[PDB]
Structures are given as C-alpha cells and as structure tokens.
C-alpha cells in the first residue's frame with residue numbers, strides 16, 4: 001500500500017547522496033529520492049540505474065546477477081510498519097518488470113528500465129505514493 005511504499009522510499013532514499021559521485025547522478029537530474037514518484041519525473045537516466053545499484057547494494061537488496069534478491073527484499077519491506085501487506089506484491093511487481101528487460105546487456109540501463117516499469121505498474125496498482133507522503137515520513141529511523 002501507498003503508506004508502506006512511502007516508508008520504504010524514505011528509508012532507501014537515505015543512501016542517494018553517498019551514491020551520487022560514483023553513479024554520475026547530478027542533483028540536476030534528481031535532487032531528493034522522493035521525487036522518483038513525482039508525476040513530473042521521468043525514470044530514464046542510465047546514471048539513475050547505476051545509483052539504484054549502489055543504493056541497493058548498501059542493503060543487500062540485489063544479488064550477484066544485479067537483480068533483486070527476493071528474500072532480502074521481502075525482509076526489508078517487512079521491516080516497515082504494515083510491511084507484510086506490500087512485501088509479496090512489491091517483489092512480484094519488480095520481478096515481472098525484470099523479466100521484461102532481461103535482454104538489456106547494460107546493468108545500469110536495465111535497472112533504470114526496471115525501475116520505470118515498477119513506477120508505472122505501482123501507479124496502475126494504486127500503491128504509488130505522492131511525494132508529499134514520502135516527505136511526511138522522511139524523519140523516521
């Protein structure tokens with residue numbers, strides 16, 4: 001659900017600044033990770049794919065094939081309030097989007113394509129939060 005997605009986003013996004021330099025993710029491409037969810041942000045930059053790999057690896061959320069680690073991602077989502085309601089559905093959505101991009105050879109580009117698909121399908125499923133709701137939880141943890 002959208003409030004659970006806001007907690008996951010607010011926490012995951014605390015690794016954006018330490019991953020900017022190695023990814024080339026300029027503040028002029030993305031200032032605050034919460035903006036990922038804005039109607040007005042296109043999820044397309046290779047640099048953002050590279051940043052998400054860096055961010056994921058901080059929490060062991062990707063496996064050695066540079067794809068989501070299903071058990072670690074389930075356990076991470078479940079670590080937030082009401083997380084069990086989102087954990088299976090979010091793992092499913094991400095993995096269905098990874099299957100659509102399996103022929104992309106460039107890991108950074110693949111990840112950003114997976115991320116855009118995940119945004120699209122989260123919006124369609126009614127679990128995409130507003131930027132305001134991520135902001136409301138930024139102080140936690």
Ligand SMILES: C/C=C\C=C\CCCCCCCCCO
Pocket residue numbers: 008009012036052056062066067068094098110111114115118
């Ligand atoms: C994790 C909370 C918000 C994340 C937004 C970026 C979406 C990244 C999902 C893809 C995860 C890595 C899988 C790509 O193979």
Ligand SMILES: [Mg+2]
Pocket residue numbers: 014015018
């Ligand atoms: Mg840190």
Ligand SMILES: [Mg+2]
Pocket residue numbers: 021022023024
């Ligand atoms: Mg680099």
Ligand SMILES: [Mg+2]
Pocket residue numbers: 031032
């Ligand atoms: Mg800022």
Ligand SMILES: [Mg+2]
Pocket residue numbers: 057060062063
């Ligand atoms: Mg690792």
Ligand SMILES: [Mg+2]
Pocket residue numbers: 071072075
């Ligand atoms: Mg684990």
Ligand SMILES: [Mg+2]
Pocket residue numbers: 106
């Ligand atoms: Mg390439």
